[PDB]
């Protein structure tokens, strides 16, 4: 917006008193309006080059680079939060699986836990004879987990756990009826 400053010095910068309908001032102010609007747009353009301050189209460009695609009616703030969370996903532990379930079902108040049967392997000394422990075999074995879920689910949640669980661990999924009643 240095258009008047860098303009030819002899040209008038001010609407002349002698004529309220001075065409020179009209042309100059028109061009100046467009110069200042382009400067404003160029100053506001910085917000599009940052993930923090990006908006619709450029934010979609960022999500396409990160691999995360906008959902139906998904605004910018929730979308960028979802991208940031997707980058920072903990994986390979019970807490991660529990969060993945709770974030594929609707809510947090549901009971969800992971059972590890290898804790109940029957050792000679410590394990009680008629106790909770069982003899080692196929199910009571390391690299095995059984996930108990306190609500209804699509079968596809199994595939979500396949995305989170560590490689080499057999998965079983237990629906518990006692929550839904």
């Amino acid at each position: 917006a240095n258009f008047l400053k860098n303009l030819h010095p002899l040209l008038r910068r001010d609407r002349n008193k002698k004529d309220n309908q001075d065409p020179n001032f009209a042309l100059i102010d028109a061009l100046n309006e467009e110069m200042n609007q382009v400067e404003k747009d160029a100053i506001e353009s910085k917000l599009q080059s940052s993930l923090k301050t990006s908006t619709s189209e450029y934010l979609d460009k960022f999500g396409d680079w990160f691999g995360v695609y906008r959902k139906t009616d998904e605004k910018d703030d929730v979308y960028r939060a979802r991208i940031i969370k997707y980058l920072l996903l903990k994986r390979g532990t019970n807490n991660a699986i529990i969060d993945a379930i709770k974030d594929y079902l609707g809510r947090d108040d549901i009971d969800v836990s992971v059972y590890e049967p290898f804790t109940n392997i029957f050792y000679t000394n410590k394990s009680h004879l008629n106790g909770e422990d069982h003899l080692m075999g196929y199910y009571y074995r390391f690299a095995v987990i059984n996930v108990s879920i306190g609500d209804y689910f699509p079968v596809e949640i199994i595939d979500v756990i396949n995305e989170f669980k560590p490689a080499g661990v057999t998965l079983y999924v237990t629906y518990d009826g006692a929550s839904t009643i």
């Binding site: 353009s45 910085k46 080059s49 940052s50 993930l51 923090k52 940031i84």
Partner: peptide, 14 residues
């Protein structure tokens, strides 16, 4: 603006 965004845009979000 683009030279600033290249080196500060992504990390600033975190």
């Amino acid at each position: 603006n683009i030279d600033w965004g290249i080196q500060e845009g992504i990390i600033e979000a975190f």
